[PDB]
Design a protein around this ligand. Structure first.
Ligand SMILES: CNc1ncnc2c(C)n[nH]c12
Length: 163
């Protein structure tokens, strides 16, 4: 876990809520994510400001987090359309900005294991609670990531080089 801690050193953390499992599975396979423009702008700002920006994913109604990943780029808009399963009210143009991500952990964590972690940037509510795009304060974000089971399929050596 030493390289993982190095990656998380001085990182920023954002909670990502997905309305469906399909888009998270697509993101795990293709190494990309898209979000609404309001969160798009926040992530682009954070990417320039921090050694690592970490997205922590939770599919709505799953009672779990599905893993976490590190931004490797700002968003980009002209490309082969990612076949997101679009939520009601969410257009393809809204999700047009595509971030490239490197997965750090593709394993699940149930909300029952994070009940002791609260987020100061969301009124000290349990970290599972938050809107899509909610920033998670450093210490709580770091501890949440360290709770996930190790993903032995990942080699963080390549991630460290991009820092
Ligand atoms: C690909 N991005 C997304 N897919 C499905 N749902 C959501 C939400 C609530 N934010 N971003 C989403």
């Amino acid at each position: 876990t030493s390289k993982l801690k190095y990656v998380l050193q001085d990182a920023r953390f954002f909670l990502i809520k997905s309305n469906n499992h399909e888009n998270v599975s697509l993101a795990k396979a293709k190494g990309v994510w898209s979000t609404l423009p309001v969160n798009e702008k926040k992530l682009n700002l954070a990417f320039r400001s921090a050694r690592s920006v970490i997205l922590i994913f939770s599919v709505r109604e799953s009672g779990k987090f599905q893993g976490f990943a590190r931004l490797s780029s700002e968003s980009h808009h002209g490309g082969s359309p990612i076949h997101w399963v679009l939520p009601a009210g969410m257009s393809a143009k809204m999700l047009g900005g595509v971030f490239k991500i490197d997965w750090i952990c593709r394993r699940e964590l149930p909300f029952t294991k994070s009940a002791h972690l609260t987020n100061p940037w969301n009124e000290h509510k349990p970290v599972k609670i938050g809107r899509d795009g909610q920033e998670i304060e450093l210490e709580c974000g770091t501890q949440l990531c360290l709770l996930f089971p190790p993903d032995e399929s990942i080699d963080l050596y390549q991630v460290i080089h991009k820092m």
